[PDB]
Design a protein around this nucleic acid. Sequence first.
RNA 1: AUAAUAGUAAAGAUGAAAUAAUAAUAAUAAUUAUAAGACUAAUAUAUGUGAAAAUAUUAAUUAAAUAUUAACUGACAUUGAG
RNA 2: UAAUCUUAUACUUAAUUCUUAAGUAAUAUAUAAUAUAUAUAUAUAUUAUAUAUUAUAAGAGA
RNA 3: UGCUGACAUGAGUAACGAAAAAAAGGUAUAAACCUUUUCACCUAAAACAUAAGGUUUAACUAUAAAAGUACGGCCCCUAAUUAAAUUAAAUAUAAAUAUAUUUAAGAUGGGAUAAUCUAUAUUAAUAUUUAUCUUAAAAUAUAUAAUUAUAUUAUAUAUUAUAUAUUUAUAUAAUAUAAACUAAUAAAGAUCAGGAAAAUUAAUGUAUACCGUAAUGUAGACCGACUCAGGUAUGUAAGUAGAGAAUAUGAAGGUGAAUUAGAUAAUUAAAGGGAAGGAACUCGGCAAAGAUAGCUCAUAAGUUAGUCAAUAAAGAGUAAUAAGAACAAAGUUGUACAACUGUUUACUAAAAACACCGCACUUUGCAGAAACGAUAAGUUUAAGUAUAAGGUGUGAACUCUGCUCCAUGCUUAAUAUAUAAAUAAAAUUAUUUAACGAUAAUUUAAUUAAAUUUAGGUAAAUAGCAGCCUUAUUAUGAGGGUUAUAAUGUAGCGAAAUUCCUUGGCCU
RNA 4: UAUAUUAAUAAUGUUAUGAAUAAUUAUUAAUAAUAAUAAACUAAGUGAACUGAAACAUCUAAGUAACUUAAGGAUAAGAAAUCAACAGAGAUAUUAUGAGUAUUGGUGAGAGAAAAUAAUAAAGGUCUAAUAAGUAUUAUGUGAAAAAAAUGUAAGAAAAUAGGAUAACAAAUUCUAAGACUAAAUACUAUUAAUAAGUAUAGUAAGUACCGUAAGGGAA
Lengths: 46, 184
Amino acid sequence: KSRGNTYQPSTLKRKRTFGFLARAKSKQGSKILKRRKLKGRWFLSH
Amino acid sequence: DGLRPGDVVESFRRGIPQTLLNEAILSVKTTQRGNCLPISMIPIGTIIHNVGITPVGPGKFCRSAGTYARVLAKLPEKKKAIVRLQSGEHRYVSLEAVATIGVVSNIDHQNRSLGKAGRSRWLGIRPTVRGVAMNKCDHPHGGGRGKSKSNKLSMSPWGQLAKGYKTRRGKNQNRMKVKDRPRG
RNA sequence: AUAAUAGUAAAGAUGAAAUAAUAAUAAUAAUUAUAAGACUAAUAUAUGUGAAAAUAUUAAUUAAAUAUUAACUGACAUUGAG
RNA sequence: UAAUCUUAUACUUAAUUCUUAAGUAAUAUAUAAUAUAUAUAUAUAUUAUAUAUUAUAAGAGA
RNA sequence: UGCUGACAUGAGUAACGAAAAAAAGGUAUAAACCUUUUCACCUAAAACAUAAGGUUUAACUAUAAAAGUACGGCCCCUAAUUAAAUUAAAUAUAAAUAUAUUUAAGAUGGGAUAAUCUAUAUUAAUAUUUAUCUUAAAAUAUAUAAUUAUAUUAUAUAUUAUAUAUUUAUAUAAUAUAAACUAAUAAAGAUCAGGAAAAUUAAUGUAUACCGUAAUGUAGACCGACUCAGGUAUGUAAGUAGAGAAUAUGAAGGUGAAUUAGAUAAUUAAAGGGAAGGAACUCGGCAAAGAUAGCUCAUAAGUUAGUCAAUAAAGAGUAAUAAGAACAAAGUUGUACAACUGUUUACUAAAAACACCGCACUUUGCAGAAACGAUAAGUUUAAGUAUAAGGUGUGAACUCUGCUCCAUGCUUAAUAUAUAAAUAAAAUUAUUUAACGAUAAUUUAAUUAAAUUUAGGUAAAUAGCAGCCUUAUUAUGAGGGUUAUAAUGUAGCGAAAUUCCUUGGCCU
RNA sequence: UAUAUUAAUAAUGUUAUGAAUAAUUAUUAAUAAUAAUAAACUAAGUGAACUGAAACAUCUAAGUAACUUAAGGAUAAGAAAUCAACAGAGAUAUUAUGAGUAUUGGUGAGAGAAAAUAAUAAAGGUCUAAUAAGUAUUAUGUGAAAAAAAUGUAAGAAAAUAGGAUAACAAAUUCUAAGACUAAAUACUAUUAAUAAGUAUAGUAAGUACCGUAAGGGAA
Ligand SMILES: [Mg+2]
Ligand SMILES: [Mg+2]
Ligand SMILES: [Mg+2]
Ligand SMILES: [Mg+2]
Ligand SMILES: [Mg+2]
Ligand SMILES: [Mg+2]
Ligand SMILES: [Mg+2]
Ligand SMILES: [Mg+2]
Ligand SMILES: [Mg+2]
Ligand SMILES: [Mg+2]
Ligand SMILES: [Mg+2]
Ligand SMILES: [Mg+2]
Ligand SMILES: [Mg+2]
Ligand SMILES: [Mg+2]
Ligand SMILES: [Mg+2]
Ligand SMILES: [Mg+2]
Ligand SMILES: [Mg+2]
Ligand SMILES: [Mg+2]
Ligand SMILES: [Mg+2]
Ligand SMILES: [Mg+2]
Ligand SMILES: [Mg+2]
Ligand SMILES: [Mg+2]
Ligand SMILES: [Mg+2]
Ligand SMILES: [Mg+2]
Ligand SMILES: [Mg+2]
Ligand SMILES: [Mg+2]
Ligand SMILES: [Mg+2]
Ligand SMILES: [Mg+2]
Ligand SMILES: [Mg+2]
Ligand SMILES: [Mg+2]
Ligand SMILES: [Mg+2]
Ligand SMILES: [Mg+2]
Ligand SMILES: [Mg+2]
Ligand SMILES: [Mg+2]
Ligand SMILES: [Mg+2]
Ligand SMILES: [Mg+2]
Ligand SMILES: [Mg+2]
Ligand SMILES: [Mg+2]
Ligand SMILES: [Mg+2]
Ligand SMILES: [Mg+2]
Ligand SMILES: [Mg+2]
Ligand SMILES: [Mg+2]
Ligand SMILES: [Mg+2]
Ligand SMILES: [Mg+2]
Ligand SMILES: [Mg+2]
Ligand SMILES: [Mg+2]
Ligand SMILES: [Mg+2]
Ligand SMILES: [Mg+2]
Ligand SMILES: [Mg+2]
Ligand SMILES: [Mg+2]
Ligand SMILES: [Mg+2]
Ligand SMILES: [Mg+2]
Ligand SMILES: [Mg+2]
Ligand SMILES: [Mg+2]
Ligand SMILES: [Mg+2]
Ligand code: NA
């Protein structure tokens, strides 16, 4: 069993979990977004 | 138990209807197996199943294969009826509570032997890992070199004693039980 | 065996004693009232009946059973290893 | 046991719907009077006065 | 073993990543690019269609063309599940929030019509899993209506000839390969008992929206830091052969590569052969070698009766006698451990460990026991009800499972028995006050728990199962007498995976 | 579906008997809608641990970090049921002295006021309450290292002839709880000006490249 390939992309899943709207919808995600904005981040979410 | 397709069963939970009233004398007609009625109608001594608590609620006790209760006494003063359940616990049940006549079907259910692990899995039963097999962090019986019981009293993964320890105790006990079930 | 009634200190056991689900948590005895199994007092002599094992509370069903006559068959019997 | 707890399930006035108030009709409960039937008590019918429109049923219960 | 940068050293060393290349020409510029021919490799793929993914890598900017029918999304519908949403007072909660209910979302699934080509809008009105046998029917041949042997047996279409509506329709008859495969049909075996959710006529409509479409996809175009021998979903996968998607070949298609040319010492790897011997090797037959049909026969002891053992070993038939493709097929036995098929340390342990079916104990009567819940409401348990569910041990079955409650627990009963907080009112004492009083302590009085103790019970609860003496001529010790205890190791097994002494004694 | 209805008209074509029913266009009137909003400062809730004590358990770190909630340009506090001591002061906030003093501590580690006098400060006093009860007080459990005011559970007053304040009591003194408002000095952010024995690795790019599934990290 060879490791290394732990990332296994699937756009839909990514958008569900790490997408902007998912962040927006949760309180915790909204707090994250705010924190990233404060930092100066160009890209707040996937 | 002896029910087969073609048999006829009534239910006298509402009461004795005007068909049978126009046409004890009624008790023997009524107390055929398979038909339901309040424990008031059911004569003392006879075997029953799907025994209720309350006069309105459904039959709760004695539902499993080959199981049954037995009417022991009835008290119209207090509106109760002492019933022996399958466990052996004598218990007050509302005198107007529901109960079907006869023993439950499939008496020979208990005698079945599952042949293999897969059958249990199909039924929806995942494997039980023994406390002695575990590590100490996981279960009190765990740890030790070789196979050991750690001088630890037989108990659950959360420290509740497994052999003999009465779990329903003190104030929170059953109010309606007349005589407790036979134990050991 | 359980429950109720009233009632009082022993009860039960044995050669004599104890131990026990005995008894001052109120028993045992008594009177009631429920349930459960298993047994069948007299008649009884196993008389009788059954191949032998067996078999006596009552009833019913089906089977088999005695004697003597009448008629028929014409030795079709006896015993019986396996 | 209206301590606790558990379970189940019409019209008319005044500020199209909404709410208040009055009286009336309808149902239920309590109290008083009258008549009838049974053994001072129980049941039925009629009249008057008062109250209501979270409930009812079941269970546990100081 | 400082941090950052720059540059050395090893060193022009190893390596350049499974590989088949050759010539001619594009081009008097080519080992590497393009073309042609030859040769090879993959071929139930290294092919052809696709899914997901991604720096568009593509046959490219003059760029991947859809009203719908063996076209997908979008849309309608819902599953798993999700939701600062939803209900003077839904319930709970230090806040955050959590729960229940509604509503909304949510594909991996379901969704009308169609080559005759087809019309989706609006308005109105009342389907787990597997199987297709046997029988029966008729058909074809042998023998003398009936027997024997052999295939065929529900559906799928063109042709020809009839009979009815009128060359277009409906029905009937006859003609017509084998082997796979599909869909749709029917009947039906087994227990493990098999999703959810969204009407029909009539009239009036319908100018048909958006997004996906390249190429790559067992890979140089994704996930692995690399153009990485790893990982990556689905469908076709020429024939010949075969039981087959095994194996050989390879029609077609695709490919022959960011390393080449030579040389082939020692040495290494991965292969092929080997005289005489045949485990003498070694910790150990590790590794290698070993297959005298794969079809049809036949196949023992033992045994839990299961061709379990078995795919038995040997052996036979067919084939072959000097041999002459690949692939499937690699002995027999004794013992230890574990019943068995399974599971396990992803990346050093696959086992004797875990699990298991069975066995036993125990808890809980359901407004339960168990678990979860800053801690609740509540949830799972369960739309279950003691033949159920939770917990514990043991681990199929055969033969069996002895004695012991001392201790730690659990469990039952005793006002046997202490102590905690909680209370009236009233007695001295102490402080203060000129006095009563005020403020402190202390001591009295009825009504006291669970706990503890005592006595049972409970060991398939946690646990335990002693030693000395010496008696039948010597020996052995059936016996005999003691001490200690809760009881004093029973059946069995025994130098055991348990035996230190130990390479115990004896046999094979 | 606001280049919407719904109605009222006007123009057009069709149906059935001048009037009625539907569709299309054009005016007039009527009907609802758009959260991207700071961060720091403040107040409240919950509240660690490393650490110190040369161990560690009371204690400490610390009501700190953190998370959560809520407000304003500031917030908080504020016109004595305050301090003091027989003399007196006479609001709150910040700083200096008082003072590392009183005080307190497994009397260890260590923690530590107030009065008073100075500044800074603004006009700093002024009713808005029919004067405050399950309140004061008590018991008990907790509660800013000293100094309380708070608080869960339950008992529970008094009218200025009274009530609060100190172990306790007696004298005295002082204040009036259970009703309220309040600039100003202060905090933080931004801007402008001035001063730099500050910065060119604290001198403008970039929260980019790149790393990570993600929170997040982060160059030259
Ligand atoms: Mg990675
Ligand atoms: Mg197990
Ligand atoms: Mg272990
Ligand atoms: Mg533990
Ligand atoms: Mg051991
Ligand atoms: Mg005889
Ligand atoms: Mg007799
Ligand atoms: Mg004979
Ligand atoms: Mg240095
Ligand atoms: Mg070198
Ligand atoms: Mg070299
Ligand atoms: Mg080299
Ligand atoms: Mg050339
Ligand atoms: Mg193959
Ligand atoms: Mg939806
Ligand atoms: Mg789908
Ligand atoms: Mg494509
Ligand atoms: Mg294409
Ligand atoms: Mg392709
Ligand atoms: Mg690769
Ligand atoms: Mg990549
Ligand atoms: Mg790598
Ligand atoms: Mg082929
Ligand atoms: Mg070819
Ligand atoms: Mg290709
Ligand atoms: Mg290469
Ligand atoms: Mg050789
Ligand atoms: Mg040889
Ligand atoms: Mg050797
Ligand atoms: Mg050797
Ligand atoms: Mg080998
Ligand atoms: Mg045999
Ligand atoms: Mg092989
Ligand atoms: Mg095994
Ligand atoms: Mg491993
Ligand atoms: Mg291994
Ligand atoms: Mg294991
Ligand atoms: Mg099991
Ligand atoms: Mg067993
Ligand atoms: Mg519980
Ligand atoms: Mg069980
Ligand atoms: Mg075991
Ligand atoms: Mg006390
Ligand atoms: Mg040993
Ligand atoms: Mg705070
Ligand atoms: Mg320390
Ligand atoms: Mg230490
Ligand atoms: Mg502190
Ligand atoms: Mg203010
Ligand atoms: Mg401090
Ligand atoms: Mg006041
Ligand atoms: Mg006052
Ligand atoms: Mg207090
Ligand atoms: Mg005041
Ligand atoms: Mg204020
Ligand atoms: Na153990």
